[PDB]
Amino acid sequence: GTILIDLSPDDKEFQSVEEEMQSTVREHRDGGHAGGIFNRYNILKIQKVCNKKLWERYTHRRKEVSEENHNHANERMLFHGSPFVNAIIHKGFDERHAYIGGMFGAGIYFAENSSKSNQYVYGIGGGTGCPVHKDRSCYICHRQLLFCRVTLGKSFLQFSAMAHSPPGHHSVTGRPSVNGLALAEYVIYRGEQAYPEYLITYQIMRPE
């Protein structure tokens, strides 16, 4: 039941999604090893992901969280990079996508920095890079990220350098406590607490 609607680069919606993508690029502590060396992207396409069943699954759960948190879903828009992006847009997030080795336990992880989600597009640590060249820094091959609606509810705040949520909480927030430039990362433990709203197709750009 998934359909993808292509947005025009003239559309304000394309533009505000592009801006969020481009403006949350940062340098990473690995010097580019996982996700490649770049300061910005070439945005090739932005598609709206439309699936009635997945949307209703998302809003049903949002209402539950809201009602357990003084009518505040604490909804954010966050990036998700994954080798399983094609399965996610068709079937939704589920316990199979649970990053077991994640630092906040086995859940589904999201990032405020697009360049952070970019590190996981070809797998954990960037895997072996792109299918075609085995290059984690490939400037040629098309990459995809999701920009997702994520319900955080009452988020457990973790300071720092499928399982269950900590009791009394709907999510975990990873607050950076060393790298002053890094933005937050988040984890949910229920697939229904995120909806994959925009599929972004892009290349990383070789710096001048």
Q: Give which of Zn ion, ligand JL9, none residue 117 binds (C-beta under 5 to 8 Å, depending on kind).
A: ligand JL9
Q: How far apart are CA 130 and CA 181, in angstroms?
A: 27
**Sign of the alpha-carbon torsion through 85, 91, 92, 93:** negative
Q: Is 114 left (phi over 0), alpha (psi -120 to 50) or beta?
A: alpha
Q: How far apart are CA 135 and CA 36, in angstroms?
A: 8
Task: Rank residues 66 and 183 by Cβ distance to ligand JL9 and give the closer one.
Answer: 183
Question: Binding of ligand JL9 at residue 73 (CB under 6 A)?
Answer: no
Q: Give which of Zn ion, ligand JL9, none residue 130 binds (C-beta under 5 to 8 Å, depending on kind).
A: Zn ion
Question: Binding of ligand JL9 at residue 117 (CB under 6 A)?
Answer: yes
Question: Binding of ligand JL9 at residue 3 (CB under 6 A)?
Answer: no
Residues after which the chain is discontinuous, using a C–N cutoff of 2.5 Å? 161
The correct pick among 120, 195, 198, 202 for binding ligand JL9 (CB under 6 A) is 120
Q: Strand 75-80 to strand 185-188: parallel, antiparallel, or no bridges (unpaired)?
A: unpaired
- Residues in contact with ligand JL9, counted by CB under 6 A, come to a total of 15
Q: Give which of Zn ion, ligand JL9, none residue 104 binds (C-beta under 5 to 8 Å, depending on kind).
A: none
User: How far is residue 91 CA from its own chain's centroid?
Assistant: 16
Task: Rank residues 34 and 172 by Cβ distance to Zn ion and give the closer one.
Answer: 34
Structure tokens at 151: 């319900």
The correct pick among 88, 130, 146, 199 for binding Zn ion (CB under 5 A) is 130
Stretch (H or E) spanning 80: strand 75-80
Question: Binding of Zn ion at residue 163 (CB under 5 A)?
Answer: no
DSSP bridge pairs for 160: 176
Q: Which of the stretches 9-17, 62-70, 109-117, 158-166 binds ligand JL9 when contact is defined by CB under 6 A?
A: 109-117
Question: Binding residues for ligand JL9, per CB under 6 A?
Answer: 79-82, 97, 99, 109-111, 116-117, 120, 123-124, 185
Question: Binding residues for Zn ion, per CB under 5 A?
Answer: 130, 132-133, 138, 140-141
